[model samples]
Target: TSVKVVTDKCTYKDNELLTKYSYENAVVTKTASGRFDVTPTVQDYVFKLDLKKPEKLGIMLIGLGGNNGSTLVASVLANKHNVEFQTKEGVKQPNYFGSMTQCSTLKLGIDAEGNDVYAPFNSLLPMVSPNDFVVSGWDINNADLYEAMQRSQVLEYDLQQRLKAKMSLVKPLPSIYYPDFIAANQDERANNCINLDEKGNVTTRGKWTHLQRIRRDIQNFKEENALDKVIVLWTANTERYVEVSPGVNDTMENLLQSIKNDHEEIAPSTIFAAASILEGVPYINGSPQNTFVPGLVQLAEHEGTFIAGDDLKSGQTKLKSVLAQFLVDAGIKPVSIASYNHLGIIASNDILYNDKLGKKVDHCIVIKYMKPVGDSKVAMDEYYSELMLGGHNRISIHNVCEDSLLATPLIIDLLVMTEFCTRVSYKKVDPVKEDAGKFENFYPVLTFLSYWLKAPLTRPGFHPVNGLNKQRTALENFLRLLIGLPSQNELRFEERLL
Candidate 1:
């Protein structure tokens, strides 16, 4: 969309004129010639949102299962996102054709030979494709990606037959499985173990070696295939939640030392995170595990590399994000939101939604948040609204937790979607220059991502109804994106509303 300049009140459109691009500084400026001009000196600038470059994405599945682990994930990624993968045995895999993380976007150029001529988005920027990433990770059971799919019970025979040969070739790296972190009952099932170091840690050497191998694998893949970007993702089973305490597992330095000291709370996921970050490969967590603990968050922040994901919200939460937004938009005052979920495919996906569709996704969401175990996981939200004539109203929501069913499909969506996520990065610019610094500095969102997140970042004060995720967060994330805009509570009279 472009803004226009006119003598009378006129709408801005393509090729509309502005005074001139600001030169003295980054802000926009207008130049004038007539001293007694009738028009008040006002200038309008037009912005052309370049949707020309489609984001390039690369995906890796951490696990496959009856829950449809890698198979379901890879299938959806290929089928929906137009991405394709090659198994370790050198066979081709396909499905999920429209995933943002796995496909290449092309710029339409000219019509030729009845086909639209185009240039790939990667032609202009550095990005990763599914084939671009080095897909490798650890699993205690040494399960072939295909067997793991069967064991997890996420996919049925129909999906399995298509993926079996490809998955069979993708096995996990040797994993360190500590029974204490998972269910006590599952300890008997552990395998592919790595022994601890003298410092009692998971052997940084082992993790470092694994990550180095993965990196080397990625580099090798890139060198051989001429791919440009590489990333890692963890889709393994969820680890029990751990605490972030000072001097214990709080800072990256402390966490590193803690690992050397064999901190009991440091699980395999964190171990993988440390190694992945150390190797400079982007790490994405598809589970709720605090793989990048506070210290790790600080570490990734410090490293300037991307680290994202906590859990999948395919079934319940997906419904909830939609519902809550509907209620909020409909002028309905929701006093409370409670959500309940259960296993059993026979369970109705209908009762999960209200006719209006309000949800508290935190309830059925996967390792998405840090919460206590054995809590029965019901998420509640209260929406209180002011009605006509000063009347007060409220609505409550509830949800219960369940495993599998949608988790498999959700997991499939999560990693393929995550692959699309890693390609998302900002083209940093001085905000004052971009938006006149009068309001806030500018940071380009992985705008291609409006499709992936629940509550994505957006412009300040003017909140987009989740429908606009690809936008900036001037108010909510100014400081977050480094724009450094003040919060509502900190605003003064001199400043404009966010």
Candidate 2:
């Protein structure tokens, strides 16, 4: 269980670890004349990690009364108190099953006989516990989270009943709502919003007021809970794409000015994101919205904080991310990938990873909402590919899952990983030049979390690496370097050469 060993590359002292890590980048690139170019580059860095974990961490949700918020709180309560429930099979104890950080393991290396060695991912470092999260947020419906949980019907009867009182008292604060951002159906249910008047009519009086108030709310939550840090997550209704034009959301200064002038393109999620960034809280978006318009992303970078998002790669898209890569890398050409989804879950937003594979495959996705199906999402994928010697291959996959349950763990993973990244800082070491030798923070955008996000938010001008395994490799190597280990090269020289 405890496989973490010490080496000269890293040292633990005074509750922090000073890791000396060296990185090498070697790749083969095709020349303009179609010849191969082989070259390598190297860089050294010192990573100073502040190993002190927070005494109390608060997780603020933008949509606190939605299905995800209800289920997330319920899961937290279930594990904290060890809630047990019964079904046709048997009695089951509640636990975090789908959480990658909590339930997954990292491959350390080969053992004495070239056997695989593994360790719990969270065990590699001091990480926050999911049960320790103090959740707070706002909702448009002004619904009590307990009642919201019941209405969600995501959890079974017994566990829901056992944790009913625990989730009862917590409700949503009034949130900002721009009518044009979300669907019109929400307008009737949006009585508990800041943009509305006391008489219940939507008002435009408080454009800049939303920013100041949301900032106040975060500070208030941090103060009341005596928490060390707070991360704001947007699991709210998905908004339509916001136009990224000049002076509106292209630069940090202009973005703030536009907010001051009450720009129409500024969605509710953008307001929350800016407020969190300015307030020094990490912000995460688990939706398919352009909330972090170029301006917001720039603001996060300028403020020297962290932000992650795009969407939760929970079910259908997650499998596609991996499956499509598998077919292409194996020399099989995919003719077309037809994915038909039947569920009341979501929208027309997902990352299509096929364009970067250098292969031609027509990838199509369809989602028709069936209200009776509720949260149970069904995805049917037909992978039709061309085989060798004029043969054909057809791979059919039908996936089903309760949507909230699948997403909740991914939400937790993002929150925890973001927290860890903030704790770890790096300083570039130049071999020939003199340096200040001070550790610096990572970039505002965290591409390390790409494995869990549908459309990974990346640094400006940098393309997102779409392969699922590559994303996971980035994460795994990052954690390994923090502990003074090399990247997972899979060079089994022990038996292969002999």
Candidate 3:
């Protein structure tokens, strides 16, 4: 809740990142056939730990107004209350489909009937639940949770009506708004602003005290609910991107200084993230704002606190990750990834016609909602992988059913697993890079979240888990086991650095 926008947020946390740079000093050799074979300079790594009470996890939802939002809130409640939520059969049941930790399949059994009889993915580790989580969030417009849920246009009338009362009471915190940071077209919807001061000072920069208040709220909730650990997640509406400028926010140290200086270039989300990290709470950015600006990244890396995310791979990216993995495992060389989307429907027709929405509006709306019917968003992505052999090339393609349905589940999963992440601990820290000139404890080369990411953060000199679920899974399992924590077979990607 005490969101501190500084480079110092990541230090001294309990988590580990085995990076590609670790292999940089390793041994490589040329095979008899003239190919190169490499050996890990350091095959494994130790992790930092921020252990807490078991099953004591907290999740903060930044925006939960849409159908995805509705389902997410409902799913989590169901998980916690042990209520029966029907899935495909329309029969009441305990469910967790969108959850990476709950719904995803792990190969624990053998497929003797067919060909592949490898171990089940789930067989490799323990199961973590997104249930037993505490949730709340910040919204710009003064719409309560139910109103926002209605605005999303995702849920069915029955579900929305049933949840109306609960949703109606939800309201968003004041947001740090910067006209320059987002597409100019969004300027009109700047109704729910966070910068205005009590004395009517509109230019105040630290106006986003929402995050700080939330921090306190979290602490209070933990004590009141008897919870042990909490993870603050930003699943807020997307803002315009900011460039990671040098000196301004290129490293953790400078970034903190910049925050104090109130650099005009910094985004409100950055301040929100900074506050979370400062409070010793792990911050994960669900939006793709440049809050992790290089400096924060350095700081987080140094401290080893987990600050995962830029964007949720719910719709397009999720499909991309799967296809990309398939291509990689099948030994196919992917040449290009092309995604196309268009959504211009807004109740405020005049606002929709604004100049800001003119340029990349299609792209922005698609990225934000991905919904087909109101909150029922849609997204389609095509991956063209070119496999070349003996002067020939081939390509493969795949398409998924529904983006919103898919995205909703993922959101549910993210909330659940993230909560679980806070409950567990890696519990160790060492020099990532020493400050002796060029020496410092850098972020681990091989962190496990890459599999759950569209663009995973990687250290210098590392082979990414970009399209390697098997290798990534293996690495995650190995690392989790090493740290003596419960390993959820299907990478429970949420984590806490402190």
TM-score of each predicted structure versus truth = 0.55, 0.94, 0.69
Which regions of candidate 3 deviate over 4 angstroms? 1-26, 29-56, 66-68, 82-94, 105-128, 187-191, 198-204, 207-226, 301-304, 324-339, 343-373, 376-404, 415-446, 461-463, 479-498
Q: What's the distance in Å from true for residue 122, model 1?
A: 11
Q: After superposition, how far is residue 115 of candidate 3 from its true place, in Å?
A: 12
RMSD of each candidate relative to the true structure = 13.3, 3.8, 12.0
The sequence of per-residue lDDT tens digits that candidate 2 reaches over residues 1-498 is: 444666898888998888777788887887999787989988888898898988667999988888899999889888988889888788998888989899999988878888998899898888888988898898888878889898888888777888888889888899898878889888876879877678877765566788999999999999999987999999998999989999788999889988888888778888999999999999888889978888888888878988886987867888887887787667667778887898760011112224553334567869889988878988999988777787989998899888999899988899899988889888898877645577779888877888888888877676787778888888988888888788887778887888
Give candidate 2's total backbone clashes. 0
Residue 126 Cα positional deviation in candidate 1, in Å, after optimal superposition: 9.2
Candidate 2 wrong stretches, greater than 4 Å: 1-3, 27-29, 198-200, 345-359, 433-435
Residue-level lDDT tens digits of model 1 in 281-375: 56666576666677876666566555654654444455556666565565554444444443330011323334555342322332343344232
Which regions of candidate 1 fall more than 4 Å away from where they truly are? Answer: 1-60, 64-68, 72-134, 156-159, 196-228, 344-498
Global Cα lDDT for candidate 1: 0.47
Report the lDDT tens digits of candidate 3 across residue range 429-455. 335643222223323222444444455
Q: What is the lDDT of residue 487 in candidate 1?
A: 25
Ranking by TM-score: 2, 3, 1
**How far out, in Å, is residue 54 in model 3?**
4.2
